Amino acid sequence: ARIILTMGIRSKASETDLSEILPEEIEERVKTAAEVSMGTEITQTDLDNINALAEQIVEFAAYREQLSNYLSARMKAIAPNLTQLVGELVGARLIAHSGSLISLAKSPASTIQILGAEKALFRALKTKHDTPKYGLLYHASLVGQATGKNKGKIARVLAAKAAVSLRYDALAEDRDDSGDIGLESRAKVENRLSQLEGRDLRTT
Amino acid sequence: GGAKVVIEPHRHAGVYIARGKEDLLVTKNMAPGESVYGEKRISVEEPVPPTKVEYRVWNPFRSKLAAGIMGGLDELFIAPGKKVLYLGAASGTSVSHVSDVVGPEGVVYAVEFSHRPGRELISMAKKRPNIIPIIEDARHPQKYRMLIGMVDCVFADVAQPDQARIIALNSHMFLKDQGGVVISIKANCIDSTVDAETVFAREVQKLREERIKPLEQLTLEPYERDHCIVVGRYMRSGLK
């Protein structure tokens, strides 16, 4: 959208350049495709609607990132230790999954582990199969840092510390919105992730 | 109409069979989300989430090449990386199916002479980028010798009595050696005073006189009365 707002037309692209969009290596490709192309030439009365749509979706993404700013702000003002541990939008869809923050706080840590994967969980319980291990908590950055079966392992330890921090946030009264319990819990999860990424199943 | 089929690859590369209780000749869709001449489609969900890719039913009563495929041809030369020169691209009916059999890495040059079919060809070649529409008479290949270079198969769905001369001229210009020559011969449009076997024998003799060795012919009888597909290869030296 930003590039068609910038140039508009192919001969206009032949006379203009751009570096704030499309970084430094697709320029020769768009210029060669501007020189030779199977595309027609548009008029101004529909280039105007093309430009209106392009500025429309540019402003749409501006609204998207500022709504994400609002979500980050309300989340770190409502349950900030969960933000310090698992992150803003992950904790947000945890809370939005379980309904209330207190209804998520009074659930055990195993539930917070498997919280997104209910259909896989209950089919793997109603026939005697193996249950999932990730759920909605798979998209946390720590589980992203883990690799192998120990992302199941630190999904478990991350759900345990997230239950700790989450019910602290929901049940505290002298809470300070400063991330202290979430930060010490995150340090615990990070050095645990370190000590099980340091081991290796090879023999040296 | 809302049923479920299983897609299975055919012997021919690039085309598929959808088995249900009636099985369908099927191709992948190069422009997903719309039908070109009102055929039905099949949408599979192949596994970032899985993506809905889709498939188009090839109708043998509206395509001589599909009638040939599902009558049983030992070798089509239309293949998933090739270049096909479609002669007599009368609309985008069979050219769309040849286009998405040939795939995104191959090229279909769709030659047509009339102009309202050419307008529909250009509007179809927008959403199928691997189609080069050429609005020109195929009886003069020099008038578009600049736009096409070194095709791998020619398909001829022209319905003119100077068919073999058109096929020979376009092959000698743009076909490569041991490339494919697929012909759809319509007996009644060549000439109706003789019978169908006489005109097929004469057309095959004309092809080998213009040094295209015929490998195979098929009558394609339940879909078209008195038609034929002759599959040959451009031998260029030594039909013997």
Binding site: - | F61, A90, S91, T93, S114, R116, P117, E120, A159, K186, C189, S192
Partner: protein
């Protein structure tokens, strides 16, 4: 080149109109523009006659594209009034179609007219 291009001259026009009248007697003629396009997309049609002087012309120029798609001969008679009079109905028609039949007593005449208008086209 006009829009209604492959027009017939007077001898071919009267040959066409005579076989149109005989097919209309033998129930082998579907007359009118949307009946003609119905039988054309159904595939039961041997050749279509459009009249090149109705009050719009694109109203039946939609049919040459269909005939080209399905490889059916099409020919332009220069009188909608004479075409309707040959069709045997009390109104002018602008398009008519000869449906295919093999238990047809005029098959040789229809094939001769098809050959004449196809060498024209």
């Amino acid at each position: 080149n006009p829009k209604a291009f492959p027009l017939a001259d007077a001898a071919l026009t009267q040959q066409i109109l005579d076989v149109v009248q005989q097919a209309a007697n033998l129930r082998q003629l579907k007359k009118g523009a949307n009946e003609a396009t119905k039988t054309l997309n159904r595939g039961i049609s041997e050749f279509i006659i459009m009249a090149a002087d109705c009050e719009p012309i694109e109203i039946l120029l939609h049919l040459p594209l269909l005939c080209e798609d399905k490889n059916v001969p099409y020919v332009f008679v220069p009188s909608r009034v004479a075409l309707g009079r040959a069709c045997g109905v009390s109104r002018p028609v602008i398009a008519a179609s000869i449906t295919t039949n093999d238990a047809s007593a005029i098959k040789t005449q229809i094939y001769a007219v098809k050959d004449k208008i196809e060498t024209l086209l």
